[PDB]
């Protein structure tokens, strides 16, 4: 049976954290920062989708052509399999053609 | 798992409470309840 008996421990969340109070701060940096930067350059994380929405296929292709030279051996095979499957799926399967 | 179901038991109980006075395995099993409690209504 799925439903737990005891109610879970109550979650405290302090909304006046450093991150939760300084979220959003320094956005709109170009429109009132005399255009030194662009807010796509405040993005931190992976090297490829640093300001680029894309698809799943489009993200996998961009990740391969920006990273794949230094990606791991099993993973490069696993990404090449992923694009070899997605190119089949998006262009030869589905509705609307 | 992200966003798995948690309140299944009340959705089961809502069906079973109208079929509680039945015979056999219809009153206890869920899969056999909806094939009868629908016909009941």
């Amino acid at each position: 049976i799925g439903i737990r008996l005891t109610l879970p421990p109550p979650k405290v969340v302090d909304r006046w954290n450093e991150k939760r109070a300084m979220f959003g701060v320094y956005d709109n940096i170009g429109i009132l920062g005399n255009f030194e930067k662009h807010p796509k350059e405040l993005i931190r994380g992976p090297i490829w989708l640093r300001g680029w929405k894309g698809n799943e296929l489009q993200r996998c292709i961009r990740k391969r052509k920006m990273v794949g030279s230094r990606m791991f051996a099993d993973d490069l095979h696993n990404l090449n399999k992923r694009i070899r499957y997605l190119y089949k799926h998006f262009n030869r399967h589905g509705k609307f053609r | 798992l992200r966003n798995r179901v948690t309140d299944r038991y009340f959705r089961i109980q809502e069906v079973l409470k109208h079929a509680r006075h039945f015979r056999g395995r219809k009153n206890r099993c869920y899969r056999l309840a909806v094939r009868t409690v629908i016909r009941a209504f």
Binding site: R4, L5, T6, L7, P8 | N3, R4, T6, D7, F10
Partner: peptide, 26 residues
């Protein structure tokens, strides 16, 4: 362990309804 609070709370309240049926207060 599911991620929930609302379903576990509804169960914990319904169990009170079942305790008041099995042994009611005087």
């Amino acid at each position: 362990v599911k991620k929930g609070f609302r379903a576990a709370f509804r169960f914990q309240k319904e169990l009170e309804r079942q305790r008041l049926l099995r042994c009611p207060p005087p």
